[PDB]
Design a protein around this ligand. Structure first.
Ligand SMILES: *[C@@H]1O[C@H](CO)[C@@H](O[C@@H]2O[C@H](CO)[C@@H](O)[C@H](O)[C@H]2NC(C)=O)[C@H](O)[C@H]1NC(C)=O
Ligand SMILES: *[C@@H]1O[C@H](CO)[C@@H](O)[C@H](O)[C@H]1NC(C)=O
Ligand SMILES: *[C@@H]1O[C@H](CO)[C@@H](O)[C@H](O)[C@H]1NC(C)=O
Ligand SMILES: *[C@@H]1O[C@H](CO)[C@@H](O)[C@H](O)[C@H]1NC(C)=O
Ligand SMILES: *[C@@H]1O[C@H](CO)[C@@H](O)[C@H](O)[C@H]1NC(C)=O
Lengths: 106, 103, 231, 111, 109, 128
């Protein structure tokens, strides 16, 4: 198992998410896994991709020096809530490395 | 809580164990043992040669786990050699059977 | 018409005898023609002998080759190819510059089996190989059957084309056709590809009758000594 | 199937083969409603090696993986000057290459 | 099912519903070859009872059970005057909706 | 001259029904010539010599040149809720590493609830 870091928002406007950056892997995603089936749907990932809904409010900045990657999301709405994950490899499910939760008190 | 007895990656067997407390007494503390194998289904017989027939039989001698192999590992590269006739020049070249894991 | 073909990475990486070719066609036959090569700074390089014979339909067909360092090509130095003919006193100058390399990316290789409906006809089966999302272009693809390479004339390869969903990305196709009996004899076919991004420069995928969307999952799960001695 | 593990996109390919002469026309639609023409690409008629003068073509379409999983069907239509109705359609969905049957056989023993 | 336990013939029906106006055209072709109009019949546009200002038709095709157990996609083309390009077709075969079947054979010991 | 084979056994099931104590037995066999002694350490700390009682080397029922010995130790019943594993050890000259630490714990032993959960997929080609 791997950590279950949790973050909150304290009313909308901005939010910041951090996950560990593995080595020797080129793909990095933050799929939301908020589906009844459970199959995680990649939201924002490298190798060129993005979410039909999440556009212009999502960006990724990988930092090998700190062994971390940073994703910045502007504003906030009702849809982009729940939980989120992080990982690598070429299999969104079975390749996760964290389970973060997103909530807003607004 | 659960300790790990086997973490084989070639056979994906994760043998573990745990003892559950009884109903507020030190007696009949039944022990447990969890086994979880994940069959590949789409892998070949000779995992490093993409010509052998498909893998039908799966034999698991649990004693050995706690050499023919079944699955690949997320931390290794598999390679082979193939003939290329570019310009009528048969030539052997190393081919990354499992790419993205040879970087 | 003066045609120039730059060397391909599939030729460089496989022969290490790289050269660049300028050829002339659709031109009245006239001996005593000079082929030269010019860089951006005016230096001349050696042009090779053994010029190609003229085409039977009374037109030119010539070969001119020279060797330039691969590091020089990677430096992005503009080069010019010139040919001289008395018909056109002004020599024709054409550029064979190599534009270094744009962001490199690996080509995903998906190989698909023939359609079920096609096999219903029991005539012939077609196997495809969809390379996808490689930048830049010039991927090289080949097919072999059970460890034996096939003729280049038994399959057709497309050319890199833009990708609407991904800016600055390219994709290509390739199809092989064989009889139904061959597909139904467990014969195995593979689609090797070659690209600069590839870590080993070569990768391959393979399918057969049993692996291409099978109708049966025959399994023989067998375990023993489950108790055993585990520590 | 591998393309699906990335949970990003999906590529359905429509393959037209054997026609003669050239100038075929391919369009994509679902549930009878035509699809936007900026989401698919079609190749020009290309000669067939063995065939004396027959040609072939191929078109691909990219959709979201979710959409594929949702269960939506996507039909492909071709219009050539030789078909008796001059129009033909085909259809594929999640239920196309499902394994028809399983034949598992567990033989658990302690010896 | 009970029709097939006779080994003489089977009938395939092509229900068409909810169109307007009348004069729909239905014909049956096998693997791209249209079949003779004598091998099948066709109903006439008759009103839809619960749905007002509507019509529906029918068509059946007789076929030997010997060849139905071998393939023969047997598509049913319809030509109305309100379709996106005026023509549509569907097909069904012996394995149109066969489901998955499990054969577990535990040798528990 | 053969490797001295060694074994260890846990307390009896019916022994854990009076709530007084428990015994753990470390059996040492072989070691020809007979040169062994056992020291019962727990967590790397040797126990008092008054607890474990080694007796003597004894020839095996059929003894060409082989021998054997038995050594037990007494613990408290209420301490087995945590185990502590009560390690045993042997020493002999006919051993490449001259130590064969042997230890068992409540967890080690016979299982009473097997829970096999095998799964079948087509994306298990690589073990993540
Ligand atoms: C499985 O495939 C491997 C690779 O082809 C076989 O081992 C190779 O054997 C060739 C000669 O036949 C050697 O040139 C290679 O060096 C071998 N590979 C390695 C990694 O040493 C292997 O024998 C095959 N197994 C079976 C059962 O056929
Ligand atoms: C299915 O497995 C059995 C053994 O369990 C074997 O006899 C048979 O040949 C297999 N089927 C095929 C098509 O190989
Ligand atoms: C199905 O499984 C049985 C039992 O292993 C076997 O005898 C039979 O051959 C299998 N059938 C096929 C087609 O593999
Ligand atoms: C179904 O299982 C039985 C019993 O093992 C076997 O005899 C039969 O061949 C199996 N059928 C198939 C299609 O595998
Ligand atoms: C048996 O294994 C399954 C799968 O891991 C688990 O959900 C279940 O809780 C286990 N039962 C016990 C008693 O541990």
């Amino acid at each position: 198992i791997l950590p279950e870091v949790k973050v909150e928002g304290e009313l909308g406007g901005s939010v910041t998410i951090k996950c560990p950056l593995p080595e020797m892997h080129v793909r990095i995603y933050l799929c939301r896994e908020m589906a009844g089936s459970g199959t995680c749907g990649t939201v924002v990932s490298t190798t060129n991709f993005i979410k039909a809904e999440y556009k212009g409010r999502v960006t990724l900045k990988q930092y090998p020096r700190k062994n971390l990657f940073l994703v910045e999301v502007t504003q906030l709405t009702e849809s982009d809530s729940g939980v989120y994950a992080c990982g690598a490899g070429m299999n969104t499910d079975r390749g996760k490395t964290q389970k973060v939760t997103l909530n807003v008190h607004s | 809580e659960r300790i790990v007895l086997v973490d084989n990656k070639c056979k994906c067997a994760r043998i573990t164990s745990r003892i559950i407390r009884s109903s507020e007494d030190p007696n009949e503390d039944i022990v447990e043992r969890n086994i979880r194998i994940i069959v590949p289904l789409n892998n070949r017989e000779n995992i490093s040669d993409p010509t052998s027939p498909l893998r039908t039989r799966f034999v698991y001698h649990l004693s050995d786990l706690c050499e023919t192999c079944y699955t690949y590992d997320r931390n290794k590269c598999y390679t082979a050699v193939v003939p290329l006739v570019y310009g009528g020049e048969t030539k052997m070249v190393e081919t990354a059977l499992t790419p993205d894991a040879c970087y | 018409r003066v045609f120039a073909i730059p060397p391909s990475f599939a030729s460089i990486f496989l022969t290490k005898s790289t050269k660049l070719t300028c050829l002339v066609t659709d031109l009245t036959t006239y001996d005593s023609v000079t082929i030269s090569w010019t860089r951006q700074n005016g230096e001349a390089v050696k042009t090779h002998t053994n010029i190609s014979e003229s085409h039977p339909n009374a037109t030119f067909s010539a070969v001119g080759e020279a060797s330039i360092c691969e590091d020089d090509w990677n430096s992005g130095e503009r080069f010019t190819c010139t040919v001289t003919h008395t018909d056109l006193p002004s020599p024709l100058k054409q550029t064979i510059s190599r534009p270094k390399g744009v962001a490199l990316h690996r080509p995903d290789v998906y190989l698909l089996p023939p359609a079920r409906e096609q096999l219903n006809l029991r005539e012939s089966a077609t196997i495809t190989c969809l390379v996808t999302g490689f930048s830049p272009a010039d991927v090289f693809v080949q097919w072999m059957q059970r460890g034996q390479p096939l003729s280049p004339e038994k399959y057709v390869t497309s050319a890199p084309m833009p990708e609407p969903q991904a800016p600055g990305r390219y994709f290509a196709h390739s199809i092989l056709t064989v009889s139904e009996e061959e597909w139904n004899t467990g014969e195995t076919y593979t689609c090797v590809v070659a690209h600069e991004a590839l870590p080993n420069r070569v990768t391959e995928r393979t399918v057969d009758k049993s692996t291409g969307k099978p109708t049966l999952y025959n399994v023989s799960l067998v375990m023993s000594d489950t108790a055993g001695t585990c520590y």
